[PDB]
Amino acid sequence: GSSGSSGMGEKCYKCDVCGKEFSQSSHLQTHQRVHTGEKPSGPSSG
Numbered sequence: 001g002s003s004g005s006s007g008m009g010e011k012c013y014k015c016d017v018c019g020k021e022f023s024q025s026s027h028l029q030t031h032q033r034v035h036t037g038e039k040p041s042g043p044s045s046g
């Protein structure tokens with residue numbers, strides 16, 4: 001696709017749940033947990 005000659009290109013790991021952003025993938029992964037715990041039912045649907 002958008003091939004080229006450029007490396008060392010990190011990404012802005014953003015959360016598609018609340019609206020956060022981290023530097024390292026792990027950081028985000030750990031955060032997401034806050035949204036996913038013990039399958040707490042809610043207004044999610046219905």
Ligand SMILES: [Zn+2]
Nearest residue numbers: 015017018019
């Ligand atoms: Zn979040």
